[PDB]
Design a protein around this ligand. Structure first.
Ligand SMILES: [Mg+2]
Ligand SMILES: [Mg+2]
Ligand SMILES: [Mg+2]
Ligand SMILES: [Mg+2]
Ligand SMILES: [Mg+2]
Ligand SMILES: [Mg+2]
Ligand SMILES: [Mg+2]
Ligand SMILES: [Mg+2]
Ligand SMILES: [Mg+2]
Ligand SMILES: [Zn+2]
Lengths: 79, 134, 48, 174, 76, 119
RNA sequence: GUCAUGGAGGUAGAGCACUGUUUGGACUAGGGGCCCGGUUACCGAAUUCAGAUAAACUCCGAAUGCCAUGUACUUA
RNA sequence: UGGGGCGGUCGCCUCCUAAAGAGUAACGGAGGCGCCCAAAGGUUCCCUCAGAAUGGAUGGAAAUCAUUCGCAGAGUGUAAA
RNA sequence: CUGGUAGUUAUGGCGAGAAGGUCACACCCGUUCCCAUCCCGAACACGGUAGUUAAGCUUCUCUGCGCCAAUGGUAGUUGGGGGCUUCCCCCUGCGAGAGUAGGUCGCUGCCGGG
């Protein structure tokens, strides 16, 4: 580990604002925050968008949409 | 006419034709052969003429194998030119054939037509030959 | 381009060695520590 | 850090009584992660290369080493020794933490998130992923982005064939 | 006419001492480009790849493994 | 799937690179060193006859040294120095063995030099 | 001069293991057509089976000639 | 100088001729030189090439990475050995 | 029995299959320290023994690739003598290349432990 030629890599605690999903994995970005978790992990409380707990392929997303029947729609629309 | 597509060197020594054929003494592909009895240079023009005569007689049935190729090239000088001042310019291609070499093979035809086609071809070559079987 | 050069002792002023260099990549005077016969020790020789 | 713990505490018994391995060290693991970028367009302008270099250094934690061309292909207006590309090699704690971040928060950012390819195996147990958008990784920001450009994260595993690598990756969470 | 016509002069390469001959130190034993014969015991390789005797003795052209040769000098 | 190379084979290659210049004789035998994870070994060899004049290791009769496995190297060096001096050996060449002259090998070499062995 | 012993050196011959030249067969990754990507033979690069060729090719390799040693036998 | 002239050549290096030591001619068959490098020299330490196959790309047959095969099919400032 | 270190043209290599062990050797665990990566404790170096023979290693079987290699015959050829001289024949001595019978999964020396 050569010194003086690497960017800082202080630990950080992740938090998912979508569903309050705590996560711990150190990251390079400081993000200017402070929060301690899991018996002491004082580090930035890095906010983030949806994590793997809500994504379609990374989670159990059910529909988020609907389907079509066309001939069913033709029968429903026409009557 | 068979001519190599590329040559490393344009001019070549003439060589010699001592001894028996190094390889090709035995017929392998067809079942009738035309074997050289003495040694001579065979040019590509003679090979083409012999092949044409051989094929035309068979009515383009059967198969023909040519077991020689004109690798070597020979040069020549014009008339009125003295000796000296370099080597001549290449003119043709030859295949030095040693005695015992088989240079034509025929398959797929009976005795009569094969023998007659080989006899017809042998009259276009400057070398005494004989007909052999497998 | 490539020229002949002479190296003289700084202490003595005796041209002790000759060599070659490229005027383009080495436009400066060449410094080399060679052995001076007169003083019988290594001195610093500079190109004239 | 934790992902290694769950790997060696739960995934290891699963591979044990799923593949019937003879001894312990026959179970496959992840050896190294190597990330590559290409700056072949930086033949004239040598500064976009540098920008990508600090991008990689920021995104991983270790400065990349600039790679030099091994040939002088005239079709790509190239000469030997021209600096093309960069690479960061992760081995140990950094590897596990980076893979955890990639799988839990980086992948759920692609514009069309339908699932990673199931046929991206070299045939001998190594997986190559091909993300091609800059801030798929949450760390870098949109304002700092100067040129959208892709990346090549490569995962090298000790498994001897494709399928057991597939189950190892699924166990990890790919 | 005749764009050719140039050749160098021959360099008299080869072997200068025979096997089993008594040889004085410092005398050439084989002139050659590259390394056709490697230096064995008590012989040395020169600047232009010649081999010379480093002591008085008897020349012996010996053989290394499958496809190499070496020459050595043994004091009597 | 990664080929984890055997370090001992490349060590053999480096040792062969070293040995192209070092070859102990009757007058000036060769001091050879082999290093394992546990411990260290040393031997004195002449290559004209291919016999070991003297030897030492970490598994000797007393072999009393345990602090950081480098004082063990110093003890081995001094012990082999004494044994070789008893047989009448005083001038040797130190065969590196393919390692680097940095750690345990360096300590053993200095310990050997501290006694009546001339390198 | 001959005999015994030891060497260096790639010619004749042969061979295809490298480099060029080259024939037939199977597959040819393809190109162009007759086409609805197939049909491909009109050419098909690499691979392979078999068969050839070389002053400036060599995995091999003589007979002689050459350099030495001898205390061998003759001879100037 | 296969008469002289016209044309070409004149010094040095490498290969074939050259007949398995050295040497060996022709207006015989092929090529190079009249430099370059302040590191492209010295020493110590370390390691290994061309090409192909598969995996993903901005980027394609060919740019940069990953695994495998790989006795030299590379390289060795420059002509050949 | 094993570890280390040499000699010998692969009959010693390559490949396939099986077994064994922390006594040795290994893989292995860690980076505070000496030391190190054009980045990476991967390697080099240092510090230890939790686990395992999966790999190296070690032993055992083979002819699959490779390597070695006869006898006989043939090509060629020093010396002598002839033809119908692009070349050919006879006598004496020497004598290959390819192919094959067959062999090969090594053989010896020293040091320390068991
Ligand atoms: Mg010459
Ligand atoms: Mg020199
Ligand atoms: Mg010189
Ligand atoms: Mg011949
Ligand atoms: Mg000669
Ligand atoms: Mg001769
Ligand atoms: Mg000229
Ligand atoms: Mg150089
Ligand atoms: Mg034989
Ligand atoms: Zn002076």
């Amino acid at each position: 580990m050569k010194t003086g030629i690497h960017p800082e890599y202080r630990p950080v605690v992740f938090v998912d604002t979508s569903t309050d999903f705590k996560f711990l994995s150190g990251s390079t970005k400081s993000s200017s925050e402070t929060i301690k978790w899991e018996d002491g992990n004082e580090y930035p409380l890095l906010r983030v968008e949806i994590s793997s707990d809500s994504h379609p392929f990374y989670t159990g997303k059910q529909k988020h949409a609907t389907a079509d029947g066309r001939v069913d729609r033709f029968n429903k629309k026409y009557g | 006419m068979l001519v190599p597509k590329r040559v490393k060197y344009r001019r070549e020594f003439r060589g010699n034709m001592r001894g028996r054929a190094k390889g090709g003494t035995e017929v392998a592909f067809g079942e009738y052969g035309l074997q050289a009895v003495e040694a001579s240079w065979i040019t590509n023009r003679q090979i083409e003429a012999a092949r044409i005569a051989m094929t035309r007689y068979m009515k383009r049935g059967g198969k023909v194998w040519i077991k020689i190729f004109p690798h070597k090239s020979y040069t020549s000088k014009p008339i009125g030119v003295r000796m000296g001042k370099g080597k001549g310019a290449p003119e043709g291609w030859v295949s030095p054939v040693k005695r015992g070499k088989i240079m034509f093979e025929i398959a797929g035809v009976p005795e009569d037509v094969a023998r007659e086609a080989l006899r017809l071809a042998a009259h276009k070559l400057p070398v005494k030959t004989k007909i052999v079987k497998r | 381009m490539r020229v002949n050069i002479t190296l003289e002792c700084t202490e003595c002023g005796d041209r002790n060695y000759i060599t070659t260099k490229n005027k383009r990549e080495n436009p400066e005077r060449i410094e080399l520590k060679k052995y001076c016969p007169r003083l019988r020790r290594v001195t610093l020789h500079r190109e004239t | 850090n934790r992902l290694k713990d769950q790997y060696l505490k739960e995934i290891v018994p699963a591979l044990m009584s799923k593949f019937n391995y003879d001894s312990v060290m026959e179970v496959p693991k992840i050896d190294k992660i190597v990330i590559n970028t290409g700056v072949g367009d930086a033949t004239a302008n040598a500064k976009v290369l540098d920008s990508a270099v600090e991008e990689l250094a920021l995104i991983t934690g270790q400065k990349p080493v600039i790679t030099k061309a091994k040939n002088s292909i005239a079709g790509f207006r190239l000469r030997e020794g021209m600096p093309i590309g960069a690479k960061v090699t992760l081995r140990g704690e950094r590897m596990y933490d980076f893979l955890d971040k990639l799988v839990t928060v980086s992948l759920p950012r692609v514009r069309d998130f339908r699932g990673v390819s199931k046929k991206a195996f070299d045939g001998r147990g190594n997986y190559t992923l091909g993300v091609r958008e800059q801030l798929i990784f949450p760390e870098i920001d949109y304002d700092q982005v100067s040129k959208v450009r892709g990346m090549d994260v490569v995962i090298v595993t000790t498994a001897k064939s494709d399928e057991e690598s597939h189950e190892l990756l699924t166990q990890l969470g790919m | 006419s005749t764009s050719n016509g140039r050749d160098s002069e021959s360099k008299r390469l080869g072997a200068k001492r025979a096997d089993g001959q008594f040889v004085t130190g410092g005398s050439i034993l084989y002139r050659q480009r590259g390394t056709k014969i490697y230096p064995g015991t008590n012989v040395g390789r020169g600047g232009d790849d010649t081999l010379f005797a480093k002591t008085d003795g008897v020349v012996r052209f010996e053989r290394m493994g499958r496809d190499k040769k070496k020459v050595s000098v043994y004091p009597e | 799937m990664i080929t984890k190379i055997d370090k001992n084979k490349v060590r053999k290659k480096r040792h062969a690179r070293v040995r192209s210049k070092i070859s102990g004789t009757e007058s000036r035998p060769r001091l050879n060193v082999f290093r394992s994870n546990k411990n260290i070994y040393a031997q004195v060899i002449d290559d004209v006859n291919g016999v070991t004049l003297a030897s030492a290791s970490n598994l000797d009769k007393d072999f009393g040294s345990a602090e950081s496995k480098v004082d063990a190297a110093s003890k081995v060096g001094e012990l082999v120095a004494k044994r070789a001096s008893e047989k009448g050996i005083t001038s040797v060449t130190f065969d590196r063995g393919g390692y680097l002259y940095h750690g345990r090998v360096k300590a053993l070499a200095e310990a050997a030099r501290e006694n009546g062995l001339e390198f």
